[PDB]
């Protein structure tokens, strides 16, 4: 018998916290329709009254509308869903006072889940933005058509960044291997004014092409060892964990 | 007569541990619906009442609802399913006290089967990870295009591991036989940062290719015998056993 507690504004609206091993007090007065609301996305499977004539039942998804229709309507409603089963003991009140207009359920486990996700998301964003413990390489040299040149190039050990001025078109940047073969490398455009192209690799030689002009960028302090990617993300302060399980 | 054992929160919720050589004493009161829950995945076969008219029966999947529809409705319920057959002694309660809102079953054998398997899986993972008493071979040489070379290479007598630095593209590794022909060998990519390629064979010579570059790896301590695989797994402490029988 989980007798619930009322709201702070109207005693007609009364909240109860679900418990799989206890039943719920509902006091129904004559002429009022009580609303029992399910958790969002929950699918109604089967319901069962004690006296199916005593109470009137209407359902629209997760909104269940109930109503008395006979004297001494003291029965129970057991509505079962895919997730849980609800347990009521409907006792009619004689003097038409202390009605309930809707019942609300509080789910400790769902709240504990969804509150964790928001905090974790805020922490993750803070961790990405913190961006500490980084070493920068600035020993980059270029030779070729200096009219497509970046104003600055550097790498942080994981990505390589090319910074372009505001009046310069953004060119294509290619991956040059040992034999001089160019090949595609994925790039993301970062920066406030989209002036930086971040390629997702550290390499000793790069090739910059725009139209019919070519520029060669050389990494003059190439570190073959690099720094390992133990976390699965672009930063060492955010782990990528396996959610799908399975 | 197994009497349903009442919970701690409410008397209306009573739990019973299944016993094939015993029955269920269900004390039903007038004007309620008793919700009997089967095990998940249990396929209802057939039921049989003492009186088809004394109690009202409606079933949905593994959900059972019954409801008395007559006075002195003392009959029996024998519902039989693919897994077992339940036994109830429906004894009407005359004063309408001490109701039984839902009957929940506990299966001892199923819980034992599920806990034995979980303990076995825990032991299996512990034995896989413990990796005790293995012998490592580090006499590996290389000659060729050193820019695609691993930073380390060894084997434990069953697999060969090539460790690559964080900035190096992971190349393709080919099995080389006596005449110099190459053939595919299966590989698994292991390591915290996915820096290790583990090939599933110990061989004297290997071939590493990436684009138009090639490197040859030479095992200078090839053991023609090795260690036999008596267990069926990659570990000497985890046996692979035949489940399917047949």
């Amino acid at each position: 018998l989980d007798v619930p507690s009322s709201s702070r504004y109207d005693h007609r609206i009364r909240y109860v916290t679900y418990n799989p091993a206890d039943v719920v007090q509902v006091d129904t007065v004559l002429g009022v329709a009580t609303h029992i609301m399910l958790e969002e996305g929950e699918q109604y499977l089967t319901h069962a009254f004690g006296d199916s004539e005593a109470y009137a039942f209407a359902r629209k998804g997760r909104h269940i509308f109930i109503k008395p229709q006979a004297e001494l309507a003291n029965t129970n409603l057991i509505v079962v869903t895919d997730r849980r089963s609800y347990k009521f003991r409907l006792q009619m009140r004689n003097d038409r006072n202390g009605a309930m207009y809707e019942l609300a359920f509080r789910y400790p486990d769902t709240q504990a889940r969804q509150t964790r996700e928001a905090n974790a998301r805020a922490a993750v964003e803070a961790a990405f933005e913190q961006r500490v413990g980084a070493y920068y390489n600035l020993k980059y040299m270029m030779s070729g058509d200096k009219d497509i040149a970046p104003v600055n190039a550097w790498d942080d050990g994981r990505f390589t960044y090319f910074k372009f001025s505001a009046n310069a078109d953004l060119p294509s940047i290619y991956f040059v291997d040992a034999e001089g073969n160019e090949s595609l490398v994925p790039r993301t455009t970062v920066g406030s004014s989209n002036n930086i192209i971040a390629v997702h690799k550290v390499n000793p030689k790069w090739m910059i092409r725009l139209g019919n002009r070519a520029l060669a960028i050389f990494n003059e302090a190439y570190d073959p060892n690099g720094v390992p990617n133990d976390t699965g993300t672009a930063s060492p302060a955010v782990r990528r964990v396996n959610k799908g399980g399975n | 007569l197994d009497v349903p054992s009442s919970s701690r929160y409410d008397h209306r919720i009573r739990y019973v541990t299944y016993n094939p050589a015993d029955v269920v004493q269900v004390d039903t009161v007038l004007g309620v619906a008793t919700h009997i829950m089967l095990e998940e995945g249990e396929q209802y076969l057939t039921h049989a009442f003492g009186d088809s008219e004394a109690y009202a029966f409606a079933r949905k999947g593994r959900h059972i609802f019954i409801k008395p529809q007559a006075e002195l409705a003392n009959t029996n319920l024998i519902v039989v399913t693919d897994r077992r057959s339940y036994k109830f002694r429906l004894q009407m309660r005359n004063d309408r006290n001490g109701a039984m809102y839902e009957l929940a079953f506990r299966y001892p054998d199923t819980q034992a089967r599920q806990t034995r398997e979980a303990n076995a899986r825990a032991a299996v993972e512990a034995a896989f990870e413990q990796r005790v008493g293995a012998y490592y071979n580090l006499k590996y040489m290389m000659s060729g295009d050193k820019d695609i070379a691993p930073v380390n290479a060894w084997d434990d007598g069953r697999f060969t591991y090539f460790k690559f630095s964080a900035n190096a593209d992971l190349p393709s590794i080919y099995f080389v036989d006596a005449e110099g022909n190459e053939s595919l060998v299966p590989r698994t990519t292991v390591g915290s940062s996915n820096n290790i390629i583990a090939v599933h064979k110990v061989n004297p010579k290997w071939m590493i290719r990436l684009g138009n570059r090639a490197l040859a790896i030479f095992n200078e301590a090839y053991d023609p015998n090795g260690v036999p695989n008596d267990t069926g797994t990659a570990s000497p402490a985890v046996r692979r056993v035949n489940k399917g029988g047949n």
Partner: peptide, 15 residues
């Protein structure tokens, strides 16, 4: 047929 009696009969009959 007191209200208790009618309540009991409705209780029994109802599905």
């Amino acid at each position: 047929k007191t209200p208790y009696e009618l309540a009991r009969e409705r209780m029994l009959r109802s599905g």
